[PDB]
Design a protein around this ligand. Structure first.
Ligand SMILES: C[C@@H]1OC(=O)[C@H]2C[C@H]3CCCC[C@H]3[C@H](/C=C/[C@H]3CCC[C@H](C)N3C)[C@@H]12
Length: 295
């Protein structure tokens, strides 16, 4: 508890006043009641860690401030952390195949958006699950997903909060669909389903913006039709862009931070194996120390 309090005291803990309702620093009276109620229930259930305001408010927002439902969601997450070995994944799991997977499925963080969010990139055009599964498995790619989430939560986001001057809880996602077929997209359905189960249930409220660029015609048409089924708050985070996406990305990410290939000015001597951002700058690294490197 003491080292956790020392960790949280070392970076800004209030969201900007523009932020969504139910976020740290932006609670109304019923939300502040539910937060104290959830904390009391989880302390009685024997939990010690991850009972800070920002964590509990993420589970609350994910369950619309239904305290019993947020309590169940938190407990399921803690049970999964125990069963999956999440608390030691950065020490146990070694993604030695990363340079090989990068040839088929680049996944990488690079710098920050104008709101201070770390920017996560994925490129889908070269995906070949059968070829990838000669050097990895779906189980190991999901292990890498959790490895990256733990690096995000424990190292990237605190440093990003220091660089921004306010709490940063979320990432800006850019997914490049250039070159993918509907058949290849179908082949990664299992991975998308399993990874999204982990995101939703164990990392709630960690997605800040979600850009899909180079969207094919059928895909963007389907999304625009299906959109009413989404939460309007969720809809406001998602941007489905075609071939001309550079001006829209540059509204959200400083040109200095956006990679050249996507319309920006940022260069890397390469990019697919890099992890460049404020969490690599000693000015913004706190008592947690520097993020580990997958490579
Ligand atoms: C949706 C998530 O919300 C965010 O803001 C990103 C956080 C980041 C944390 C580190 C692990 C991956 C990656 C996440 C997931 C990206 C998904 C999108 C669907 C295709 C594939 C499953 N990738 C991993 C997205």
């Amino acid at each position: 508890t003491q080292q956790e309090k020392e960790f949280l005291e070392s970076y800004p803990q209030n969201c900007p006043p523009d932020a969504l309702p139910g976020t740290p620093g932006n609670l109304d009276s019923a939300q502040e009641k539910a937060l104290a109620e959830l904390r009391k229930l989880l302390e009685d259930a024997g939990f010690i860690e991850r009972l800070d305001d920002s964590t509990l408010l993420r589970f609350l927002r994910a369950r619309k401030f239904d305290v019993q439902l947020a309590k169940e969601m938190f407990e399921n997450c803690e049970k999964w952390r125990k069963d999956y070995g999440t608390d030691t994944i950065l020490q146990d799991f070694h993604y030695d195949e990363k340079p090989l997977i990068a040839k088929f499925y680049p996944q990488y963080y690079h710098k920050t958006d104008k709101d201070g969010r770390p920017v996560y990139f994925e490129e889908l055009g070269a995906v070949n699950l059968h070829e990838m599964n000669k050097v990895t498995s779906e189980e190991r790619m999901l292990k890498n997903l959790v490895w990256e989430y733990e690096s995000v939560v424990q190292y990237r986001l605190p440093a990003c909060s220091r660089a921004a001057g306010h709490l940063v809880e979320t990432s800006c996602t850019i997914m490049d669909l250039k070159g993918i077929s509907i058949s290849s997209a179908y082949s990664v359905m299992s991975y998308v389903r399993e990874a999204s189960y982990i995101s939703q249930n164990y990392y709630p409220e960690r997605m800040g913006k979600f850009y899909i660029i180079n969207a094919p015609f059928g895909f963007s048409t389907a999304f625009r039709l299906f959109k009413p089924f989404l939460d309007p708050v969720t809809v406001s985070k998602i941007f489905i862009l075609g071939s001309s996406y550079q001006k829209e990305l540059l509204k959200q990410i400083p040109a200095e931070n956006l990679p050249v290939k996507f319309g920006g000015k940022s260069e890397v001597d390469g990019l697919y194996l890099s992890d460049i951002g404020p969490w690599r700058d000693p000015k913004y690294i706190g008592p947690e120390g520097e993020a580990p490197e997958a490579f």
